[PDB]
Symmetry: C5
Amino acid sequence: VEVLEVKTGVDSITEVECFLTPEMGDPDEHLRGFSKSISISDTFESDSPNRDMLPCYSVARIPLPNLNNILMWEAVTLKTEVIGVTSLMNVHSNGQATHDNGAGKPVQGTSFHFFSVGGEALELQGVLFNYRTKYPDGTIFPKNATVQSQVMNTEHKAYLDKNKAYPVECWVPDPTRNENTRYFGTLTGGENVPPVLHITNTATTVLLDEFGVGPLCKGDNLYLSAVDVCGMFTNRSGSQQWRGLSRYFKVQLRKRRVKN
Amino acid sequence: VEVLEVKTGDSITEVECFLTPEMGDPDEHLRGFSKSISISDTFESDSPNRDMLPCYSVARIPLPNLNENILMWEAVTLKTEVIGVTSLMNVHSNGQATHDNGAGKPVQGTSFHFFSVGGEALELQGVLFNYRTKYPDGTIFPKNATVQSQVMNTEHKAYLDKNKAYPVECWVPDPTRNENTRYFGTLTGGENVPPVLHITNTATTVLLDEFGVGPLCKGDNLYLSAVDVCGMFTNRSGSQQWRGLSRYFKVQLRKRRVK
Amino acid sequence: VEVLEVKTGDSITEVECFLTPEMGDPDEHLRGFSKSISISDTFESDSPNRDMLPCYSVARIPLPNLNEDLTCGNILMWEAVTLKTEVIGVTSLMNVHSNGQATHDNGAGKPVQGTSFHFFSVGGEALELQGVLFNYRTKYPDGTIFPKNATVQSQVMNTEHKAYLDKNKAYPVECWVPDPTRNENTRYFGTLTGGENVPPVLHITNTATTVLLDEFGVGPLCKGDNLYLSAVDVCGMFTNRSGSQQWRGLSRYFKVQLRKRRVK
Amino acid sequence: EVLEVKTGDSITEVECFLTPEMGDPDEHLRGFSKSISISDTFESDSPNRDMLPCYSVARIPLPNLNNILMWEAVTLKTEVIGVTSLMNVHSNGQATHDNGAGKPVQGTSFHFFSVGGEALELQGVLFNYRTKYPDGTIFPKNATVQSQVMNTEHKAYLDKNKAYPVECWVPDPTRNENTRYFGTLTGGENVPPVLHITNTATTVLLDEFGVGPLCKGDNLYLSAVDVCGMFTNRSGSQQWRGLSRYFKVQLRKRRVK
Amino acid sequence: EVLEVKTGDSITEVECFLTPEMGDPDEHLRGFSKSISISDTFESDSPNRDMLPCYSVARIPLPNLNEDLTCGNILMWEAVTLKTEVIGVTSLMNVHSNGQATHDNGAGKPVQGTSFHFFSVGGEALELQGVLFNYRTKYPDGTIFPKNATVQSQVMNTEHKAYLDKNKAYPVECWVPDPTRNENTRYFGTLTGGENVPPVLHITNTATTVLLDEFGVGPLCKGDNLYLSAVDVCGMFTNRSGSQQWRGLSRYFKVQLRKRRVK
Ligand SMILES: CC(=O)N[C@H]1[C@H]([C@H](O)[C@H](O)CO)O[C@@](O[C@H]2[C@@H](O)[C@@H](CO)O[C@@H](O[C@H]3[C@H](O)[C@@H](O)[C@H](O)O[C@@H]3CO)[C@@H]2O)(C(=O)O)C[C@@H]1O
Ligand SMILES: [Cl-]
Ligand SMILES: [Cl-]
Ligand SMILES: [Cl-]
Ligand code: NA
Ligand code: NA
Ligand code: NA
Ligand code: NA
Ligand code: NA
Ligand code: NA
Ligand code: NA
Ligand code: NA
Ligand code: NA
Ligand code: NA
């Protein structure tokens, strides 16, 4: 692709605004946004997580206005934030008291907050904590796993092309690809780490690369991806479940002429 | 709305006030505190009492009347901080000794520090931890909740239009709206989180957007909103109460011509 | 007053001061410490002893005398432009051998830790205070200056509680904060870090300067050729072998550069 | 003498990944060390080879160039590959409390990377100068008690994989003129990993004179350590866990004399 | 009065390391203190010398200036930049010897707890002010400590002025840089308190600190001597018994200097 001029004038810009719901496992009709309680295998050989115990990547493919030496929509800016951060102040709903007569233990512990904006599906590389883990039917996971899959097995390449299917723990953005995506993520690990969730409508991320070029939307499609595992909820029994929240996206795009 | 020139010269005004916290105020001695926390045994039986629920604070401030092609007040800058941070050093008032012969456990745990400045009420989106929570009479809460309310139900839209009414835990700023408000908040979660509270009279936040335009005050009203849940106080017994503090606002406004 | 030009040439001066902490000093051996903390039996009966309450520190520093001759429509005032500051004696908190509480069997003593308040201000007049009470039913002791006529509203904001930091070892830290509605002629800075296990994090350097000018380029203007310096440096608590806990404070160094400013 | 940058055929890119070398104690445990044991005394400290993480290195031949031209490394993009794998708290872990999830990877971490025009230069520093390092490792020789603080005899090059233990070597700050290195040790028994990923961050490798590493013999050297913390199994036993590191380096031709 | 920089042997570099001085309680324990004992009463605090970490200092001779008689002006070496880091950070990964398990079957507790990381570069000795945790502490023979201590020594006794002019002598816990002096030194330090604080140690050869003041002048080396000072108490090592020893690491310094004419 030779990238040529940006179009200007009123008709040259469009906006996408939406939210992506979290896909934490949803183990019953009352527990949207939560995983199944987390149960521990007695060996690496016997690790066999149920589908409703595994958070997955969220993805949306957003059609843009049809454009067609062609024009492509170029993603320029992102505003994003996590929706519902104050819901984590519910310390009165079958939580585990943190001491005798105390309030319930807030959601805390391992978190993964991730978002991406691209002109095509996010490209994934598989990495397994334990290559002998048996992933469940209904999920898309690294196949033909070997012990090398615990560090780097280049066979595990996939596209984030289905919602509620790609387990978070199996897949990361492939840093060897993703030229046409901008991605951002943070894993904070530990059973007691505190969520720190900032909200504001005053913050913008610029999506242009060092050449001044943003993601270019192939086929006039914008891909948005997210994970917002906020931590674990500990109930009165001591059982723990992942808890996720939705993510808001607002993306500004402009028409860009290319030669491909 | 077409935004035209800033007036110069009579063209400026300042709003200064404090917003008191609304933590629940369970009796005549406990302004700034909630009721002590109790925990349901199931999600279906979660039924928090009104005095156990911190709520958003709001003040709707009349500005000097304009226009008897009009002028509007434009909010340009904010100074803000939390008032009374040192009160949290009281570790001697019938708290829970941290060990034998020790001082009382200080206020700590989950905090939410939030403020907004707008030219109209803050727009809210409801999100529920547990959609089966029964919110109490005298609060304004997400109605017709479903399990999807635990992640995003677009029916739950409201305005922060009443003080001591909108519980913190079931509402956030709506990021799909609020074009005419600037909002900022941080939730820090965990029972052992230490309050970290900074004070200074030297820090200013600019409220202009990327086009150089601040909130424009509809009807010559400025809306200030806040939450400052600092953490929980632990009583000798182990029972825990939310503790909040007031927030200072100083807003500088200027007259802007609009069509 | 209208602020006019800065004088150049005899036109600058420097104040260098240390302010000692006022933690309560319960006996002739315990400068820098409070009395050990005692907890009231009921919330209503909170009644801290004076020597248990850290107080704000203040010094008023006389500057070189200005306006010795009759002047017409204008005077000079010293304008505070820059500050260097840090906490003096941070390494003393490495004494983990002086009859503290072992962290575990055979271990070293638990270091000073827990709730801290580090605060400083520079002004051309006393720091203006607003009272806020944790518990409006607390009985504050003789020898302290505390919010009077307390009501339940005092727990969040009672505008009756206005004071000046105009006496050392008198205004309890827990009762008073800088009044954000006043202090036009002071620059203040503070951080409360709350929690019994909070670690002190104390930085020292002679390479860091804070500029005291406001957005109009004007620093504090020293009324009567006096500079007001205020501080609190509650570093945390020391835990004795018995488990009893005392606040521990440290001194604060101040270096302020001032220039002569003409005012109308 | 460093002269002008060539412009125009003047650039090349290296992209690769370095796998971690944590000890690999059996055919199922690539990326992990042996379980960590505690010798009774410094005198008895004799760590098993499989318990010792090592530095990773790759030597990458570049396009042949030859007053000569050298490849100059200008920019780096890097990140840790597989950070989400640490979400597996359901595999032979130790419950944090009754009915809880497994304790996640936590505790001491070392995240380190370097880009140079020659092998990374190492200085040995020993926690305990009496440690017996095992056959198959390359370690500080003729150790003395001064090796616990600084013994200038302990100089080496990071010139072999599965060989140089992390705990006894650091980048030599007295050398490495032709390398850029970056590392963070985060200690503590319970510290939580904090791992950021993004394809939007670039590190510039030029020094204060505008000169990057110059690749001797048209070879680029990449080195890494990514000990993420320890995995606690159901018994309470702990193993180091490491992850691979991605590198993308942009290079340009530079004339030198 | 500082005049122009001389250009053209107008620059020199100092590169060295300073070893830590933690107490070295026996022939095997260089870099460690004696294990910490606690006094039976506050008044009876009496630390042994080998329990007390001390400040490190080196005085480095520079190329001799002013060999010929000069009239009203001399040259001085001016320190302009510093590169520094802690040497041996990975040694703290030895959790496999002589330690106390973190939990049943776990690895040894790592070095953690109170740290002090400090460095200075000056054209003369670092100037110190004494502050005592406890004025009734008996400091041991072989150390240089605040003398004629009074209760005011617990907060600020201006008697307690010293120069960091001897290695293995000035206890860390007794002394800090004197902010009322040190015009001709640049100093930097951080105390991180608490028994469980985790070390966070960064290394890189890409970071430079500029030593120039707000007038563009660095430390000026009196008598062509450069003073480097350091403390790097990284935390405490815990033995199986529970006893705890301070552990320190060496510090690397690289300083660039230029010749500056002065009146
Ligand atoms: C900050 C504060 O007020 N702490 C109190 C709390 C709170 O007021 C309460 O948790 C807020 O919801 O209450 C503590 O318990 C007292 C509370 O239960 C009251 C209610 O009337 O009763 C007190 O005990 C009475 C007892 O009920 C009588 O039978 C007896 O004659 O007198 C007792 C003493 O008045 C409880 O102490 C609490 O720990 O939650 C006390 C805190 O200090
Ligand atoms: Cl479940
Ligand atoms: Cl009780
Ligand atoms: Cl093993
Ligand atoms: Na709540
Ligand atoms: Na695959
Ligand atoms: Na107090
Ligand atoms: Na609703
Ligand atoms: Na000491
Ligand atoms: Na009063
Ligand atoms: Na998982
Ligand atoms: Na050697
Ligand atoms: Na090791
Ligand atoms: Na002395």
